[PDB]
């Protein structure tokens, strides 16, 4: 037997858009101090998942706008970077999550734009790599988070773009995939970052769309779902990262869209709402975004067109004039 999930006959096969909006709106309402403290280290991203999935369904107005904007403002530190929450240390992951939220509400000037760019600059090394924070953790995610943030600020050339691309291309392995560091194992998540990186910096021509697309397509299991790496169970989050990468490299038509669609829909919850990783498990705002964004790429008309690089509504990125060219 091969490692894969089995979609049941009574599994959800229709989009429950209403019960998804009600789930996100009711999430966080429960005064659970434990779950809050346990996930406060990524709250800035937690709101990003929550808001983006609501704006895709055209229900962004149901969220408290002012409270979030006041939260982000008090999250920016003296060094420019934005932490995950109040009291935490600044990081690229939450700096990007902050900007993405401020872009949805078109309130980018709540936070000093200049000091943010200056924070991203100081994280770039001599080779072209980027660190997560001032402690110097090297990863290709941070290379993506860097150029993604600066692209939403209109100041991409602020960093050494020439060397930044030089580092990412050095992380490419034999199978065409990318990893954390030069020599690391290929991972669908890191590919999503590197393909998104080379899209913003306009270097998709130096990517083997056939070989890399081949690696991504081999991640599709008989259930229709996608996984991050060989011999891994299918996951909705992985289903988005692999799908979005294909759309970037221009090889989206290779995978079975109908089977993957039925996989994502099967991960729904007919009682509570939201998306889980696999049919049967507990749902969360994290997978709820990638479940909705996944169906949007497959052409779900009830969901706004989503950008494969920034994971944001296309109408939002059309406003700020940032839409990187994708492979035809």
């Amino acid at each position: 037997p091969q490692k894969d999930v089995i979609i049941k006959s009574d599994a959800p096969d229709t989009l429950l858009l209403e019960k998804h909006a009600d789930y996100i709106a009711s999430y966080g309402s429960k005064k659970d101090d434990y779950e809050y403290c346990m996930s406060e280290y990524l709250r800035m991203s937690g709101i990003y998942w929550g808001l983006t999935v609501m704006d895709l369904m055209g229900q962004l107005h149901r969220m408290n706008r002012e409270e979030i904007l006041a939260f982000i403002k008090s999250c920016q530190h003296e060094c420019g970077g934005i932490s995950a929450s109040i009291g935490h240390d600044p990081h690229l992951l939450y700096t990007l999550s902050a900007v993405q939220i401020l872009t949805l509400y078109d309130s980018i000037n709540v936070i000093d734009v200049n000091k943010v760019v200056e924070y991203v600059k100081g994280l770039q090394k001599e080779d072209g790599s980027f660190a997560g924070d001032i402690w110097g953790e090297i990863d290709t995610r941070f290379s993506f988070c860097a150029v993604a943030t600066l692209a939403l600020l209109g100041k991409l050339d602020a960093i050494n773009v020439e060397k930044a691309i030089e580092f990412v291309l050095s992380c490419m392995n034999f199978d065409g995939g990318f990893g954390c560091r030069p020599g690391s194992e290929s991972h669908a998540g890191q590919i999503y970052c590197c393909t998104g990186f080379l899209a913003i910096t306009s270097q998709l021509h130096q990517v083997n769309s056939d070989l890399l697309g081949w690696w991504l397509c081999e991640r599709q299991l008989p259930s229709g779902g996608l996984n991050g790496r060989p011999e891994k169970l299918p996951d909705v989050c992985y289903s988005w990262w692999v799908l979005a990468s294909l759309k970037i490299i221009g090889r989206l038509h290779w995978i079975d869209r109908e089977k993957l669609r039925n996989f994502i829909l099967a991960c729904q919850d007919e009682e509570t709402g939201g998306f889980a990783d696999r049919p049967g498990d507990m749902v969360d705002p994290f997978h709820t975004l990638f479940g909705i964004a996944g169906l949007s790429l497959l052409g779900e008309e009830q969901i706004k067109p989503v950008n494969p690089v920034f994971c944001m509504p296309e109408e939002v990125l059309q406003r700020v004039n940032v839409q990187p060219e994708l492979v035809s």
């Binding site: 346990m38 280290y41 402690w135 194992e185 081999e218 011999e231």
Partner: protein
């Protein structure tokens, strides 16, 4: 009186290391309600356990008291810091700030860097995939350098990492973060030493035989062979490739239906074709 309970436990945990230095792992037991006059932490032999009713009240307290130290709302003692960061990371190793606080204490000459390697080692037994623990450990290891053969004290440190990477890979199927850190050690701490690279091949030959469907483990195999080529221009490199391609074929004939074994074979084939 609820704040009094928490101060007792963080002492019971701190003194638990006074009880036994080498603690194996930290777990969690389902105690729906508190037992009378019994500390929520229970250690039997090497193992350390925490009752379920404890986590509801302990975690949000220690979490809050660390944010106050970060926002200058409440000053915590030097020893109080290493005690609140200790109990926080045994419940949530993904807390970046909690690690960063320890990063400051270590760099200020307050905290011993080895104590974090012993703390993280316990954090990898309950949270073997938690990246922040691996992220922090990389920072500590690189800090332990600069206060062509690596020092003997470093050789003991490298082999120490090989043990915690193996056990973390044995608690979670194909632990990417565990194998990626194991590779990171060979790149910086070992400097791709041809000696250690060969010894690690034989150590992982048994694991691959007992753990297929683990591309992260088999990628470590690929990384070893690649580094052996970058060093040469001793042991015959094609001879090693001859043995590996047969070792992979043996596992496929034995256990069919694993794409990792097939992906591994292609990766080995590519190394053979690119020597001419």
């Amino acid at each position: 009186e609820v704040a009094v309970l928490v101060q007792r436990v963080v002492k019971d945990i701190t003194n638990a290391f006074r009880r036994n230095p080498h603690i194996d792992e930290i777990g969690l037991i389902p105690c729906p309600e508190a037992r009378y006059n019994r500390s929520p932490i229970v250690l039997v032999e090497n193992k350390l356990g925490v009752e379920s009713w404890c986590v509801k009240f302990l975690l949000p307290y220690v979490h809050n008291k660390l944010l106050l130290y970060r926002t200058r709302k409440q000053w915590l003692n030097r020893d109080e810091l290493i005690d609140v960061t200790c109990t926080l990371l045994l419940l949530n190793p993904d807390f970046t700030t909690a690690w960063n606080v320890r990063k400051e204490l270590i760099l200020s000459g307050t905290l011993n860097p080895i104590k974090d390697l012993h703390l993280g080692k316990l954090a990898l037994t309950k949270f073997p995939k938690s990246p922040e623990t691996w992220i922090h450990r990389r920072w500590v290891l690189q800090q332990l350098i600069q206060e062509t053969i690596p020092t003997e004290r470093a050789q003991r440190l490298i082999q120490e990492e090989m043990e915690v990477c193996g056990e973390a890979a044995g608690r979670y199927p194909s632990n990417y973060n565990a194998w990626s850190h194991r590779i990171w050690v060979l790149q910086h701490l070992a400097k791709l030493d041809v000696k250690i690279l060969l010894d690690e091949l034989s150590s992982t030959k048994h694991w691959a035989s007992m753990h297929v469907s683990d591309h992260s483990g088999f990628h470590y195999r690929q990384f070893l062979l690649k580094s052996l080529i970058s060093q040469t221009v001793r042991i015959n490199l094609p001879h090693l490739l001859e043995e590996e391609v047969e070792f992979s074929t043996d596992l496929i004939d034995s256990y069919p239906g694993h794409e990792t074994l097939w992906c591994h074979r292609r990766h080995i084939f590519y190394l053979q074709h690119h020597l001419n």
